[PDB]
mmCIF file of C-alpha atoms and ligand atoms in Angstrom:
data_model
loop_
_atom_site.group_PDB
_atom_site.id
_atom_site.type_symbol
_atom_site.label_atom_id
_atom_site.label_comp_id
_atom_site.label_asym_id
_atom_site.label_seq_id
_atom_site.Cartn_x
_atom_site.Cartn_y
_atom_site.Cartn_z
ATOM 1 C CA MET A 1 122.274 -4.813 -84.294
ATOM 2 C CA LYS A 2 122.499 -5.127 -87.832
ATOM 3 C CA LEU A 3 126.226 -5.583 -90.108
ATOM 4 C CA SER A 4 126.919 -2.292 -92.482
ATOM 5 C CA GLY A 5 126.081 -4.138 -95.612
ATOM 6 C CA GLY A 6 129.238 -4.023 -97.421
ATOM 7 C CA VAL A 7 130.925 -6.359 -95.065
ATOM 8 C CA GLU A 8 129.581 -9.050 -97.028
ATOM 9 C CA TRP A 9 130.769 -7.659 -100.188
ATOM 10 C CA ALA A 10 133.866 -6.817 -98.982
ATOM 11 C CA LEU A 11 135.137 -10.787 -97.689
ATOM 12 C CA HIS A 12 133.626 -11.903 -101.170
ATOM 13 C CA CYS A 13 136.023 -9.782 -102.511
ATOM 14 C CA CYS A 14 139.075 -10.534 -100.376
ATOM 15 C CA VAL A 15 139.261 -13.756 -100.918
ATOM 16 C CA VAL A 16 138.270 -12.929 -105.194
ATOM 17 C CA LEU A 17 141.400 -11.425 -104.762
ATOM 18 C CA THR A 18 144.304 -13.105 -103.250
ATOM 19 C CA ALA A 19 143.207 -15.569 -106.945
ATOM 20 C CA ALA A 20 144.089 -12.505 -109.073
ATOM 21 C CA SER A 21 147.243 -12.414 -110.022
ATOM 22 C CA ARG A 22 147.448 -8.973 -111.277
ATOM 23 C CA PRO A 23 145.134 -5.990 -109.512
ATOM 24 C CA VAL A 24 141.688 -5.894 -110.368
ATOM 25 C CA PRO A 25 139.514 -2.126 -110.510
ATOM 26 C CA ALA A 26 136.724 -1.975 -108.574
ATOM 27 C CA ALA A 27 134.079 -2.125 -112.162
ATOM 28 C CA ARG A 28 135.279 -5.399 -113.374
ATOM 29 C CA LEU A 29 135.228 -6.604 -108.611
ATOM 30 C CA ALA A 30 131.731 -5.054 -109.941
ATOM 31 C CA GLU A 31 130.745 -7.083 -112.025
ATOM 32 C CA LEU A 32 131.724 -10.097 -111.330
ATOM 33 C CA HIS A 33 129.339 -9.975 -108.172
ATOM 34 C CA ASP A 34 126.674 -7.968 -110.161
ATOM 35 C CA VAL A 35 126.169 -5.112 -107.885
ATOM 36 C CA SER A 36 126.697 -1.902 -107.936
ATOM 37 C CA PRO A 37 130.306 0.047 -108.922
ATOM 38 C CA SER A 38 130.150 2.944 -106.860
ATOM 39 C CA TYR A 39 128.581 0.890 -103.848
ATOM 40 C CA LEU A 40 131.372 -1.608 -104.076
ATOM 41 C CA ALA A 41 134.393 1.189 -104.581
ATOM 42 C CA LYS A 42 133.083 3.110 -101.165
ATOM 43 C CA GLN A 43 133.872 -0.773 -99.455
ATOM 44 C CA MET A 44 137.194 -1.025 -101.182
ATOM 45 C CA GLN A 45 137.895 2.266 -100.429
ATOM 46 C CA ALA A 46 137.703 2.023 -96.970
ATOM 47 C CA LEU A 47 139.466 -1.376 -97.206
ATOM 48 C CA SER A 48 141.722 0.882 -98.202
ATOM 49 C CA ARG A 49 142.251 3.346 -95.400
ATOM 50 C CA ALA A 50 142.947 0.629 -93.010
ATOM 51 C CA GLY A 51 145.333 -0.808 -94.876
ATOM 52 C CA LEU A 52 144.326 -4.220 -96.244
ATOM 53 C CA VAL A 53 143.803 -2.769 -100.071
ATOM 54 C CA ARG A 54 145.822 -0.615 -102.019
ATOM 55 C CA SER A 55 144.637 1.131 -105.465
ATOM 56 C CA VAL A 56 147.637 1.191 -107.374
ATOM 57 C CA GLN A 57 147.015 4.330 -109.779
ATOM 58 C CA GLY A 58 147.252 3.833 -113.853
ATOM 59 C CA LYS A 59 144.928 2.534 -116.157
ATOM 60 C CA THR A 60 146.204 -0.253 -115.885
ATOM 61 C CA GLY A 61 145.179 0.034 -112.145
ATOM 62 C CA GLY A 62 143.006 -1.237 -109.417
ATOM 63 C CA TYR A 63 142.786 -2.533 -106.142
ATOM 64 C CA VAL A 64 145.216 -5.487 -104.606
ATOM 65 C CA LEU A 65 146.040 -7.521 -101.670
ATOM 66 C CA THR A 66 149.007 -5.514 -99.508
ATOM 67 C CA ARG A 67 149.455 -8.530 -96.988
ATOM 68 C CA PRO A 68 149.142 -12.074 -97.478
ATOM 69 C CA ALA A 69 145.735 -13.854 -97.050
ATOM 70 C CA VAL A 70 147.252 -15.499 -94.161
ATOM 71 C CA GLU A 71 147.816 -11.939 -92.413
ATOM 72 C CA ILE A 72 144.117 -11.040 -93.168
ATOM 73 C CA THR A 73 141.805 -11.856 -90.126
ATOM 74 C CA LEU A 74 137.515 -11.754 -90.335
ATOM 75 C CA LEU A 75 137.731 -9.524 -87.879
ATOM 76 C CA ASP A 76 140.669 -7.231 -90.302
ATOM 77 C CA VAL A 77 138.377 -6.317 -92.551
ATOM 78 C CA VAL A 78 134.795 -6.625 -90.755
ATOM 79 C CA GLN A 79 135.904 -3.299 -88.719
ATOM 80 C CA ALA A 80 137.599 -1.713 -91.992
ATOM 81 C CA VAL A 81 134.312 -2.483 -93.435
ATOM 82 C CA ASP A 82 132.279 -1.190 -90.001
ATOM 83 C CA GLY A 83 134.522 0.267 -87.944
ATOM 84 C CA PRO A 84 135.947 -0.593 -85.057
ATOM 85 C CA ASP A 85 133.389 0.799 -82.237
ATOM 86 C CA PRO A 86 131.853 -2.158 -80.088
ATOM 87 C CA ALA A 87 128.755 -3.094 -79.918
ATOM 88 C CA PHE A 88 127.868 -1.785 -76.103
ATOM 89 C CA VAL A 89 128.631 1.943 -75.748
ATOM 90 C CA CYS A 90 128.278 2.268 -72.053
ATOM 91 C CA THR A 91 127.559 5.404 -71.318
ATOM 92 C CA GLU A 92 128.487 5.564 -67.126
ATOM 93 C CA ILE A 93 124.165 5.960 -66.434
ATOM 94 C CA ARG A 94 125.085 4.721 -63.387
ATOM 95 C CA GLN A 95 126.583 8.352 -62.464
ATOM 96 C CA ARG A 96 122.819 9.902 -62.497
ATOM 97 C CA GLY A 97 120.571 10.319 -60.165
ATOM 98 C CA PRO A 98 119.658 10.711 -56.543
ATOM 99 C CA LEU A 99 122.055 7.201 -55.703
ATOM 100 C CA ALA A 100 124.609 7.826 -58.090
ATOM 101 C CA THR A 101 127.711 5.609 -58.056
ATOM 102 C CA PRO A 102 129.715 8.298 -55.778
ATOM 103 C CA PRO A 103 133.478 9.446 -57.221
ATOM 104 C CA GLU A 104 135.839 7.065 -55.741
ATOM 105 C CA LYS A 105 133.857 4.406 -57.035
ATOM 106 C CA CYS A 106 133.890 4.710 -60.467
ATOM 107 C CA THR A 107 138.038 3.729 -61.217
ATOM 108 C CA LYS A 108 136.393 0.297 -62.327
ATOM 109 C CA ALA A 109 134.115 -0.395 -65.631
ATOM 110 C CA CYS A 110 130.508 -0.725 -64.525
ATOM 111 C CA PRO A 111 129.970 -4.920 -63.992
ATOM 112 C CA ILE A 112 127.437 -4.382 -67.096
ATOM 113 C CA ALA A 113 129.361 -2.562 -69.296
ATOM 114 C CA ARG A 114 132.612 -5.029 -68.307
ATOM 115 C CA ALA A 115 129.618 -8.156 -69.240
ATOM 116 C CA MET A 116 128.567 -6.208 -72.046
ATOM 117 C CA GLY A 117 132.539 -5.686 -72.843
ATOM 118 C CA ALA A 118 133.354 -9.387 -71.832
ATOM 119 C CA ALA A 119 130.779 -10.613 -75.294
ATOM 120 C CA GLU A 120 132.616 -8.262 -77.566
ATOM 121 C CA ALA A 121 135.736 -10.326 -76.191
ATOM 122 C CA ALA A 122 134.267 -13.356 -77.722
ATOM 123 C CA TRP A 123 132.543 -12.178 -80.836
ATOM 124 C CA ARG A 124 135.699 -10.426 -82.214
ATOM 125 C CA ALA A 125 138.017 -13.137 -81.267
ATOM 126 C CA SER A 126 136.438 -15.767 -82.564
ATOM 127 C CA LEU A 127 136.560 -13.828 -86.326
ATOM 128 C CA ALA A 128 140.050 -12.822 -84.979
ATOM 129 C CA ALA A 129 141.353 -17.070 -85.042
ATOM 130 C CA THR A 130 140.006 -17.171 -89.022
ATOM 131 C CA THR A 131 141.613 -15.702 -91.820
ATOM 132 C CA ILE A 132 141.426 -15.148 -95.962
ATOM 133 C CA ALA A 133 143.982 -18.037 -96.235
ATOM 134 C CA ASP A 134 141.029 -20.334 -94.204
ATOM 135 C CA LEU A 135 138.373 -19.105 -96.573
ATOM 136 C CA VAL A 136 139.480 -20.425 -99.608
ATOM 137 C CA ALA A 137 141.001 -23.257 -97.961
ATOM 138 C CA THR A 138 137.817 -23.941 -97.863
ATOM 139 C CA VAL A 139 136.566 -22.859 -101.071
ATOM 140 C CA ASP A 140 139.021 -24.973 -103.021
ATOM 141 C CA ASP A 141 137.533 -28.354 -101.077
ATOM 142 C CA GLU A 142 133.606 -26.927 -101.684
ATOM 143 C CA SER A 143 134.001 -25.988 -104.271
ATOM 144 C CA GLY A 144 136.707 -27.517 -106.132
ATOM 145 C CA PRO A 145 140.066 -26.814 -106.859
ATOM 146 C CA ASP A 146 139.800 -24.832 -110.661
ATOM 147 C CA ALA A 147 137.157 -22.568 -109.208
ATOM 148 C CA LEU A 148 138.557 -19.277 -107.841
ATOM 149 C CA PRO A 149 141.548 -19.450 -110.253
ATOM 150 C CA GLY A 150 138.827 -19.354 -112.952
ATOM 151 C CA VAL A 151 137.006 -16.851 -111.123
ATOM 152 C CA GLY A 152 141.244 -15.239 -111.368
ATOM 153 C CA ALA A 153 141.187 -15.751 -114.970
ATOM 154 C CA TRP A 154 137.918 -13.501 -115.352
ATOM 155 C CA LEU A 155 138.622 -10.816 -112.811
ATOM 156 C CA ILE A 156 142.512 -10.210 -114.963
ATOM 157 C CA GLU A 157 141.071 -10.805 -118.349
ATOM 158 C CA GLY A 158 142.306 -7.645 -120.712
ATOM 159 C CA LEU A 159 144.742 -7.014 -118.630
ATOM 160 C CA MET B 1 127.103 -2.446 -84.954
ATOM 161 C CA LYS B 2 125.849 -0.320 -82.657
ATOM 162 C CA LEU B 3 123.075 -2.427 -80.570
ATOM 163 C CA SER B 4 119.840 -1.077 -79.626
ATOM 164 C CA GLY B 5 120.458 2.442 -77.050
ATOM 165 C CA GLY B 6 118.482 1.445 -74.727
ATOM 166 C CA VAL B 7 120.596 -2.335 -74.045
ATOM 167 C CA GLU B 8 122.210 -0.535 -71.292
ATOM 168 C CA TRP B 9 118.993 1.104 -69.018
ATOM 169 C CA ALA B 10 117.901 -2.458 -69.139
ATOM 170 C CA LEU B 11 120.055 -4.498 -68.132
ATOM 171 C CA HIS B 12 120.407 -1.489 -64.975
ATOM 172 C CA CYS B 13 116.583 -1.958 -64.964
ATOM 173 C CA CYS B 14 116.216 -5.507 -64.725
ATOM 174 C CA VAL B 15 119.317 -5.131 -62.244
ATOM 175 C CA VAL B 16 117.745 -3.135 -59.657
ATOM 176 C CA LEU B 17 114.777 -4.457 -59.901
ATOM 177 C CA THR B 18 116.141 -7.479 -58.576
ATOM 178 C CA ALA B 19 116.348 -5.419 -54.891
ATOM 179 C CA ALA B 20 112.791 -4.960 -54.850
ATOM 180 C CA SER B 21 110.148 -6.780 -53.445
ATOM 181 C CA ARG B 22 107.312 -4.419 -54.881
ATOM 182 C CA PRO B 23 106.244 -3.211 -58.405
ATOM 183 C CA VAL B 24 107.783 -0.367 -58.948
ATOM 184 C CA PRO B 25 107.299 1.579 -62.012
ATOM 185 C CA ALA B 26 108.915 3.108 -64.690
ATOM 186 C CA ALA B 27 108.894 6.102 -63.890
ATOM 187 C CA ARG B 28 110.459 5.833 -60.346
ATOM 188 C CA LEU B 29 112.832 3.653 -62.748
ATOM 189 C CA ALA B 30 113.312 6.832 -64.993
ATOM 190 C CA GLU B 31 113.193 8.530 -61.016
ATOM 191 C CA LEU B 32 117.074 6.827 -60.344
ATOM 192 C CA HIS B 33 118.171 6.598 -63.365
ATOM 193 C CA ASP B 34 117.616 10.084 -64.287
ATOM 194 C CA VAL B 35 115.907 9.665 -66.979
ATOM 195 C CA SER B 36 112.331 10.519 -69.393
ATOM 196 C CA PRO B 37 109.909 8.385 -68.637
ATOM 197 C CA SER B 38 108.457 7.789 -71.855
ATOM 198 C CA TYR B 39 111.798 6.464 -73.098
ATOM 199 C CA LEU B 40 112.569 4.130 -70.137
ATOM 200 C CA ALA B 41 108.817 2.478 -70.529
ATOM 201 C CA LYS B 42 109.647 2.385 -74.569
ATOM 202 C CA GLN B 43 112.531 -0.262 -72.629
ATOM 203 C CA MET B 44 110.012 -2.217 -69.832
ATOM 204 C CA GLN B 45 107.626 -2.396 -72.571
ATOM 205 C CA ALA B 46 109.573 -5.156 -75.131
ATOM 206 C CA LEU B 47 111.128 -6.404 -72.105
ATOM 207 C CA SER B 48 106.874 -7.240 -71.382
ATOM 208 C CA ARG B 49 106.430 -8.365 -74.026
ATOM 209 C CA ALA B 50 109.283 -10.612 -74.257
ATOM 210 C CA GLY B 51 108.023 -12.237 -70.884
ATOM 211 C CA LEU B 52 110.855 -11.074 -68.476
ATOM 212 C CA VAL B 53 109.060 -7.986 -66.920
ATOM 213 C CA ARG B 54 105.270 -8.468 -66.078
ATOM 214 C CA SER B 55 102.765 -5.219 -65.759
ATOM 215 C CA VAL B 56 101.405 -4.800 -62.031
ATOM 216 C CA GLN B 57 98.252 -2.497 -62.060
ATOM 217 C CA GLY B 58 96.680 -0.511 -60.234
ATOM 218 C CA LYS B 59 97.673 2.663 -58.153
ATOM 219 C CA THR B 60 101.005 0.675 -56.069
ATOM 220 C CA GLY B 61 101.370 -1.270 -59.404
ATOM 221 C CA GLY B 62 104.461 -1.149 -61.792
ATOM 222 C CA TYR B 63 107.016 -3.951 -63.134
ATOM 223 C CA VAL B 64 107.842 -6.539 -61.551
ATOM 224 C CA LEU B 65 110.734 -9.570 -62.610
ATOM 225 C CA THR B 66 108.582 -12.326 -64.079
ATOM 226 C CA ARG B 67 111.764 -14.980 -63.584
ATOM 227 C CA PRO B 68 114.534 -15.505 -60.557
ATOM 228 C CA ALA B 69 117.429 -13.472 -61.311
ATOM 229 C CA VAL B 70 119.340 -16.444 -62.060
ATOM 230 C CA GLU B 71 116.531 -18.105 -65.036
ATOM 231 C CA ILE B 72 117.033 -14.241 -66.911
ATOM 232 C CA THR B 73 120.409 -14.278 -69.116
ATOM 233 C CA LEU B 74 121.969 -11.457 -70.716
ATOM 234 C CA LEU B 75 120.861 -12.573 -74.152
ATOM 235 C CA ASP B 76 117.318 -12.616 -72.426
ATOM 236 C CA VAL B 77 117.074 -8.737 -72.616
ATOM 237 C CA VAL B 78 119.641 -7.783 -75.221
ATOM 238 C CA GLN B 79 117.488 -9.806 -77.484
ATOM 239 C CA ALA B 80 114.320 -8.466 -75.608
ATOM 240 C CA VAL B 81 115.239 -4.721 -76.593
ATOM 241 C CA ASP B 82 117.672 -5.132 -79.935
ATOM 242 C CA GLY B 83 115.660 -7.772 -81.270
ATOM 243 C CA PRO B 84 116.825 -11.663 -82.004
ATOM 244 C CA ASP B 85 117.623 -11.624 -86.118
ATOM 245 C CA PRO B 86 121.287 -12.187 -86.676
ATOM 246 C CA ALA B 87 123.741 -8.874 -87.559
ATOM 247 C CA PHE B 88 124.932 -10.555 -90.869
ATOM 248 C CA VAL B 89 122.809 -11.768 -93.322
ATOM 249 C CA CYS B 90 124.018 -13.889 -96.077
ATOM 250 C CA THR B 91 121.902 -12.982 -99.787
ATOM 251 C CA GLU B 92 123.650 -15.635 -101.864
ATOM 252 C CA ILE B 93 125.687 -13.381 -103.878
ATOM 253 C CA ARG B 94 127.790 -16.903 -104.830
ATOM 254 C CA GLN B 95 124.841 -17.240 -107.158
ATOM 255 C CA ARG B 96 124.780 -13.728 -108.649
ATOM 256 C CA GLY B 97 126.822 -12.854 -111.772
ATOM 257 C CA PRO B 98 128.519 -15.039 -114.765
ATOM 258 C CA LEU B 99 130.182 -17.319 -112.929
ATOM 259 C CA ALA B 100 127.096 -17.834 -110.520
ATOM 260 C CA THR B 101 127.833 -21.439 -108.889
ATOM 261 C CA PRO B 102 125.202 -23.630 -109.689
ATOM 262 C CA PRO B 103 121.960 -24.420 -107.143
ATOM 263 C CA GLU B 104 122.268 -27.780 -107.118
ATOM 264 C CA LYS B 105 126.295 -26.852 -106.247
ATOM 265 C CA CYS B 106 124.585 -24.656 -103.543
ATOM 266 C CA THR B 107 123.770 -27.578 -100.570
ATOM 267 C CA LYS B 108 125.636 -25.973 -97.785
ATOM 268 C CA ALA B 109 125.971 -22.463 -96.758
ATOM 269 C CA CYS B 110 128.923 -20.061 -98.093
ATOM 270 C CA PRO B 111 131.503 -20.813 -96.389
ATOM 271 C CA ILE B 112 132.245 -17.252 -95.080
ATOM 272 C CA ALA B 113 128.711 -16.920 -93.837
ATOM 273 C CA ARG B 114 129.626 -20.293 -91.682
ATOM 274 C CA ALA B 115 132.394 -17.673 -90.465
ATOM 275 C CA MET B 116 130.229 -14.823 -89.502
ATOM 276 C CA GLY B 117 127.680 -17.847 -88.130
ATOM 277 C CA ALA B 118 129.848 -18.549 -85.564
ATOM 278 C CA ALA B 119 130.780 -15.112 -84.391
ATOM 279 C CA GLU B 120 127.499 -14.504 -83.961
ATOM 280 C CA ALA B 121 127.249 -17.356 -82.132
ATOM 281 C CA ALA B 122 130.019 -17.056 -80.082
ATOM 282 C CA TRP B 123 128.653 -13.668 -78.822
ATOM 283 C CA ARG B 124 125.547 -15.208 -78.025
ATOM 284 C CA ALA B 125 126.521 -17.977 -75.814
ATOM 285 C CA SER B 126 129.445 -15.116 -73.667
ATOM 286 C CA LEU B 127 125.681 -13.435 -73.022
ATOM 287 C CA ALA B 128 123.933 -16.508 -72.232
ATOM 288 C CA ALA B 129 126.584 -17.573 -69.839
ATOM 289 C CA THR B 130 125.863 -14.584 -67.783
ATOM 290 C CA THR B 131 122.803 -14.195 -65.083
ATOM 291 C CA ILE B 132 120.896 -10.842 -63.701
ATOM 292 C CA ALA B 133 122.578 -12.431 -60.759
ATOM 293 C CA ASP B 134 125.522 -12.952 -61.755
ATOM 294 C CA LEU B 135 125.252 -9.041 -62.189
ATOM 295 C CA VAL B 136 123.469 -8.770 -58.340
ATOM 296 C CA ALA B 137 126.683 -10.429 -57.286
ATOM 297 C CA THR B 138 129.658 -8.042 -57.931
ATOM 298 C CA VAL B 139 127.552 -5.238 -57.691
ATOM 299 C CA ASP B 140 126.806 -6.851 -53.371
ATOM 300 C CA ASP B 141 130.987 -7.558 -54.435
ATOM 301 C CA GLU B 142 132.073 -4.265 -55.423
ATOM 302 C CA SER B 143 129.865 -1.777 -53.979
ATOM 303 C CA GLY B 144 128.835 -3.268 -51.060
ATOM 304 C CA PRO B 145 126.104 -5.600 -49.516
ATOM 305 C CA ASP B 146 124.232 -2.294 -48.710
ATOM 306 C CA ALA B 147 124.316 -0.509 -52.510
ATOM 307 C CA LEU B 148 121.007 -3.108 -53.758
ATOM 308 C CA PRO B 149 119.365 -3.174 -51.024
ATOM 309 C CA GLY B 150 119.708 0.470 -50.813
ATOM 310 C CA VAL B 151 118.027 1.179 -54.310
ATOM 311 C CA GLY B 152 115.161 -0.978 -53.993
ATOM 312 C CA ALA B 153 113.962 0.395 -50.326
ATOM 313 C CA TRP B 154 114.349 3.565 -52.700
ATOM 314 C CA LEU B 155 112.166 2.499 -55.981
ATOM 315 C CA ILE B 156 109.402 1.242 -53.263
ATOM 316 C CA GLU B 157 109.102 3.920 -50.904
ATOM 317 C CA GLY B 158 106.058 6.273 -51.151
ATOM 318 C CA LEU B 159 104.409 3.710 -54.405
ATOM 319 C CA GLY B 160 101.606 5.624 -54.617
ATOM 320 C CA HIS B 161 103.417 8.636 -55.582
HETATM 321 O O1 SO3 C 1 106.791 8.853 -57.030
HETATM 322 S S1 SO3 C 1 107.234 9.823 -55.242
HETATM 323 O O2 SO3 C 1 107.615 8.216 -54.593
HETATM 324 O O3 SO3 C 1 107.811 10.419 -55.852
HETATM 325 S S1 FES C 2 127.157 2.594 -66.352
HETATM 326 FE FE1 FES C 2 127.020 2.294 -68.475
HETATM 327 S S2 FES C 2 126.134 -0.542 -68.325
HETATM 328 FE FE2 FES C 2 126.187 0.443 -66.210
HETATM 329 S S1 FES C 3 127.491 -16.304 -99.942
HETATM 330 FE FE1 FES C 3 126.092 -14.870 -98.628
HETATM 331 S S2 FES C 3 128.657 -14.423 -97.559
HETATM 332 FE FE2 FES C 3 129.209 -15.884 -98.644
#
């Protein structure tokens, strides 16, 4: 099982966008992280379709967050980039074969499906409990208070 | 993310094997679930390399669990079929570019990596806290105590084929 490789890039992008006082073009985000502009654009566009960033046009355009950092969870970002579908997909195999779960016993999910679902709930709940704000606060502590504003400064030059 | 599609079948195989008092071949497990024998065989071989099932040779051979149900966790089965590797891999992107942070200042894992590592720990822990025995007990409770024994009886019927 592998998480969409864009998740790491998107999360970092959300973090540095909190430090940008103005819209940031996908190309400058890509230059900061030394990554393919077209590739980074794809992840930003997934964030966009999830209502977490918006692009605003022109030449002075680029990307902004659409609400405060405290209101965007790692689960919001992970589901935008990697998708909403649960890791385990029950295909109702219990209804196959000569000793299939009879038709009126199919009103509850399969117990295996249920147990798998509960670990999904725990992965989701962990991701929902942390915000972009939380990440920023940790970076502030570990890198020092000037680090992210230094990045933000660099991000907006020429604008 | 999507778990290997084998996991659903492998979990059901582990459950039904607890009710079997004899080795059950993959072919018969495959007839039970109405699935291609070669496809199910691949799943059973993953369980075998992980030490969860053992293959019994010969005509009345087939698969047996190698431990009591209570000592086989969902995590054991999931990692047997899907692999142990974590879903999120930090590639140290913080050390790339013009404003790259220093290698001496990279003493702890990046805060993002840590959070993603904790989520995966929570998924792992939840799977590790459920056993095949738990699954059996729920099926006993929900299908009636004769369901699994009825399946077991059917799985060993006419061994030798
Ligand atoms: O393998 S025979 O029981 O159909
Ligand atoms: S029917 Fe899908 S997990 Fe059992
Ligand atoms: S450097 Fe890899 S997640 Fe931040």
